[PDB]
Design a protein around this ligand. Structure first.
Ligand SMILES: [Ca+2]
Ligand SMILES: [Ca+2]
Ligand SMILES: [Ca+2]
Ligand SMILES: [Ca+2]
Ligand SMILES: [Ca+2]
Ligand SMILES: [Ca+2]
Ligand SMILES: [Ca+2]
Ligand SMILES: [Ca+2]
Lengths: 325, 324, 325, 324, 325, 325
């Protein structure tokens, strides 16, 4: 067999495929957010009995999509400064909020960390505590989250997740020790696709950290790789042979490329050139359309792990320099 | 690597592991069926335009779990006889009702065939048209159907599927040309596990055809094989390390072995001794506890395909002799 | 690894590679057929005791290559019409005629169905009952049928199969209830390659159904995919490093592309764009050279399963419309 | 997945499963050999132009099964001794006689080497030049040689190979520089199963070298491993679900374990305890029933490669001691 | 294929296979430690520039095997307490000390953390900075560390690693804020096997954390699994067919089962019943022979990940109770 | 999955990628060889008691890199001619000199054969007896030999191997029955890469046999294939994300393409076009830059086995014609 390869790096850097979105993309999202804003946010922070000594940990509950109650953690490092910067952290596919001690990186660097639990997931590599609540009937689907409600953008799973995620920034901003001028939205892989949505839809985010982003350039992802989770879509289309146009129409409303074209905040991206889960052409498509000030860290030899702890160093340096003005 | 192997056949034939079920197993199912019976069945058969010439095809809708509307097909062979025997057909994992022409076997053999669509699935190997409707919140789960609602038997996905399947036999029986003395429940793999449940829960079924059954002896299945779909449960338990006792309690209410101990109608089973999706020990555990008159066809060299078209011949000969 | 991909669709639709055949291609086939016609067809249809109720089943025996007796099934739906249309069904690799109840589709749609057993196979996924009878010595070969007798077109396995298949249509035509104006030849995968040969060699076929055809564009197939059964040819060539020119000369006489260029009857093809057993470039090469009226159904997300039950629907609609003209 | 393991070594050393053969096993082989002996052997040795300098190479042709003409190589080391000992070398599955320079080991150790080409193979890992000639119709079969004619011992492929192989020893013995008191029959894997047959059927062989033998204890092999080529039999049985008894009856006539029970010449065996192509329980079954003086070299950590060049050293030493 | 399974749990709980060690096992280790103690430990702690805010990070250097200079990190949480408890952390196969921010768990829980870099590794999943120094010639070996110097225990790779690890505890104990009554040795997988050796050889360790231990019951490991790294041994033995007795003789001196029989400090073990890297029978053999006060957490459905974050919670609670006395 | 494919043959035939070497490449090698030449070669040939009858077998010892003692075999066929031609044979990755009877081909063809043992390997498919002796510290590395000392060309493993190999030709030339006008350097795979280095560095070699060469065009190899052993370099780079430039700078001094540009003796190459261990583009890059008289045998359907026994025949014929003048 042939080892994975995408477009050459010189082509990746110029890759700007034709965008496809419906004319009501913005109106869809405006209505979605307006509907959810009719419910009070009702943020709840409850301090936990914990063995943690350098951080205070809080159980979080807030109202996400249509008032539905989403879990999280808030880790506050024990420091003298009265207002601290904050990272809102979104989680990779099949993960959930786990335990507070699973998210010590940002607090150790002096940042408040808001970890948003992902509705209905939390059963693959880290446990979760938040259910999904569907729009009535749960249509035929392929196992997983990628095709859950895919026949209509109004019923699609990521409509609810992205709305949760925009509301999570509001919930973080409500914590009294959070410096609202230094709120960062962050994620890798599904988390990066969520953060990319939030960068276009939120008014409160001040910077984006976007690693090896998933949920980008769907039509290309499906043709390029046979890995999960993009293969969920392919397997659905293999069966539902009459639904191709509808499937990609729905997905157009949730595509990171279309959000990137609307985002204005400063962003640090990362990409692995041998990543066969989130292919480099899908990541570069999103990066290249990203409309805010931007940088990308390129890891030529890395698969889905990306830059690992090297990239974490880059992120801390990037934010320090940004927030010095 | 090591080739798949289960217990030797001589051990499989005596394999009767200790059963685990809760005290309220029967009460759970009695309440479930009573609550769904409060909605009218409202079976609808709508003759469709079709290119089929030897068969009349109907679009089916009936009320399953809690009045929720389930799709299916009814295929009636064009024959002179006024009352015909009927097979109620349940579908394998990730399948759905597909097209009428996907179910030509039983009609061709002179049987009315009622194909029940599987709620929420239909996206893997044959398309489906029936949604699931959850009991409120859809809890954290691993991709698929095996762990959907698994923390409480009341919320568990197969509660709804098994209720649909019991109601499907009532729907079939309400068709005027069906001979109610010759209603057969049939399935292979997930369909076999569904049919095994129906064999204990239904009052209308007269015979069971149970091929290579899934949804049997969960605790053993999860230790034995790393194949999907049983690995969905294993993967959930890898993450939710605190939920093991709860998971297996819930599953006990849906285990084919526990239904088999309650079933009284005549049954023909099949098993593939090299089946690593539905291991022979889980299938023999169910067969060995099956409380009605029973036979099993054993296919020593077959994987999940079982007896294939050979077993289809065994089934037709079995039912002919039974109903004489 | 890399996920399978062939030429882009826009290139596939224009793909007309240079054809290679010997100057005696037609003479080879004329002599082959003339030599087999010297034996009487002697078609025998024997009614069977069956549990089937909507269809009458017949055990079939007829003379194929050089008078050799080939088995089949004939399924006749119980309908009032005195002359019925007929599908001659060829079978995929490692399959055979199985049981009569394995072929209920076409009879259920009102067609007589003649299923031809495949000589010497019948041991992979459906049982068969017909032997092969070689031209004397059985030369060194790689396991399978693809290299059986490959050093000479006169000894090659598919010379015998394709002659059996041309005689199968004569056998079907001899059944009294068959409408000879509505004889269809049909197959998928090896069956599709057999059917493609018959479309060029038979005088009795009126329409072709050709799904995901095997036995097409061998030189491309062997360099594109490492899957069986094309890999049998590759494996033979890895060992018999002196026989490359002879192997591809022999295969030129049996290539679906060379038959397609001679076929004049109306045809419906199908192709799976992710099919790595019968690659889309080999299928499109045959489709593009096909010299009769033609259509193709394209399944972008399907592998070797092709259009499945969706394509069955297309085939029934195609034939209904054709035979109403 | 799980890593391959067979019976523990202590159990392997005592493993003597019940043997199955038909009452006419000996008569079947007596009648097969007598029929082929009615054609003259007509051994032809044709010196070749070669770049080889330490060895003389001959193109061999002789009559095997029913007078059919089998190819081979004869390699004679250029030594002063007027009569030399001889190794008759059988080849592994999908191999053939290749080139003369592929068989330099035994000649370099001072032995004449007769390499028998394998009918109809020669297309996997080493080229071959000898065709098969079937007993009329070539029945339905799974790809390969293991199920070619398997529905009748008289049509089965290995009937013709084993007969060739017995005649190969007669052909080698006819070469004037061969010392007939020091004729060795040798093989690994398919070669070893061939050699094991020849050790029971030939009158001319004086010693057996049998490495990691294939064609042994078929019923166990098929249940134990899913590797090729034993899997060819399994796959044929998955489809021809009515032919199980007939398949194993045929195979009984060709099983190394039944030949081993009849062999009287001295033998050196080898076995790899992690061999998942020729499992150690099938090899030990044949070794344990072997009726002549015998030794086995056991390689606990090796797969199908066995003892490799270490074993080759064992074989040279074994034969030197034996022929002193 | 067959999914991985070891002995049933009820058998695992009683599994005490016969131990094999040479008569000079203790003398070998006494001599090894005495020889390395002749070089000064010369521990160096160098406060480094870091973006970490809740922790003080130190570059560590100390003398391990025969005076050779080994790297590490020391992470000290910023807390008012003047003496703190300490975890000496050993690293999994193909890993190294990485960056200080890779080891935030224990400091966040109020423990000083001493992370020992692994000589010659650090190139698989986390970077390292410490070379190996062989005893003269580097004999023929299979790729990796398992068979490096395996023909003599005096030249074997893990002789040098285990001596470094015993000296790492002495280096940690020399830090003035370390409470010497609360020094813990900890590791998972290779780290667990190192920690197990240290639990027998060190005089300063007060508690052992030993997760999914590697380097245990080699003869069984090599029989049971075909995974790396145990398969490095098998692959060496496949080639060096004359060296079986020598290989297992050497390995006996480094076997966690033989150290466990000598260890007296309180321990918490963990085991995954589906672990095919470190099989449960090799782990239970070590646990069952462990001579100090002991508990084991059993994870029936987990592979080599073990208890993950659940086990981390178990470790924190275990130590808190132990050191309350 | 996608089956392996490299550039089309017509492109391979013209493939001359831009070469990268440091401006001290020649000076590095001149100094390396001069430093090793300060130690006496001290060749030792000791006749063995052997069961071989057509060949005399000698145990060889000679001084390779910096006086270090390297093992080998010398096989002398028993012929009347007083001086014989000689093949110096280098060995594939994870192999060693094995037993004398493993190398009977060249002696049987009337050539003396000098088999050089490969330092530190000999544990994968054929046993070896020669250790490595590192330049002091053995830095962090990935399992295997490709990354051993890779951070500095002075410490790199192949500096020592290539020096041994140049000295092996001198050792061979010292045997009294060797005709020094007919000394051939030969290898496949790692052996071919070693031989290619020797063809530029040795003054005594008269012809090169170079099959499916490894150690060629590293930057391309690492992008193209995910197979071992080239993946050892990729794996090292995935972790040491800061060391890319250094790694490829080191490797430039050991790249077969750069030696090929300097080699002047006649050469026979071979290449398998389906070889995914040594890709055809890396082999053709070296062949195309080869500066001496050259021929290549192309095996379009072979993987890493190349031309096998067919190529052995090509080699014997090639050398016969060459040495006839
Ligand atoms: Ca708009
Ligand atoms: Ca009760
Ligand atoms: Ca309708
Ligand atoms: Ca012509
Ligand atoms: Ca007898
Ligand atoms: Ca002692
Ligand atoms: Ca420092
Ligand atoms: Ca220079």
């Amino acid at each position: 067999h042939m080892a994975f390869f995408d477009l050459p790096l010189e082509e990746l850097k110029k890759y700007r495929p034709e965008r496809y979105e419906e004319k009501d993309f913005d109106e869809f999202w405006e209505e979605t957010l307006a509907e959810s804003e009719k419910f009070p946010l009702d943020p709840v922070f409850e301090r936990m009995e914990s063995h943690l000594k350098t951080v205070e940990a809080y159980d979080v509950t807030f109202s996400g999509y249509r008032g539905q109650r989403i879990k999280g953690w808030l880790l506050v490092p024990k420091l003298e400064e009265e207002k601290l910067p904050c990272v809102v952290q979104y989680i990779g596919y099949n993960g959930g909020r786990g335990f507070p001690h699973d998210w010590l990186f940002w607090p150790s660097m002096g940042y408040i960390c808001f970890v948003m639990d992902t509705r209905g997931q939390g059963s693959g590599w880290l446990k979760g505590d938040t259910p999904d609540y569907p729009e009535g009937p749960v249509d035929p689907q392929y196992p997983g989250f990628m095709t859950r409600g895919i026949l209509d953008p109004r019923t699609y799973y990521y409509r609810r997740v992205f709305t949760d995620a925009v509301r999570a920034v509001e919930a973080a901003a409500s914590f009294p020790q959070v410096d609202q001028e230094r709120i960062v939205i962050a994620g890798g892989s599904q988390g990066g696709g969520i953060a990319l949505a939030v960068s276009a839809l939120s008014k409160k985010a001040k910077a984006l950290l976007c690693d090896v982003p998933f949920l980008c350039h769907f039509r290309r992802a499906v043709q390029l790789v046979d890995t999960h989770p993009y293969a969920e879509i392919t397997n659905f289309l293999k069966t539902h042979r009459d639904k191709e146009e509808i499937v990609f129409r729905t997905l157009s409303y949730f595509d990171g490329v279309n959000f990137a074209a609307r985002a204005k905040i400063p962003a640090l991206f990362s990409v692995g050139l041998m990543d066969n889960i989130c292919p480099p052409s899908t990541v570069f498509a999103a990066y290249n359309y990203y409309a805010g000030p931007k940088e990308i860290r390129i890891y030529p030899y890395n698969n889905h792990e990306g830059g690992g702890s090297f990239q974490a160093v880059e992120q801390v340096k990037f934010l320090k320099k940004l927030f010095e003005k």
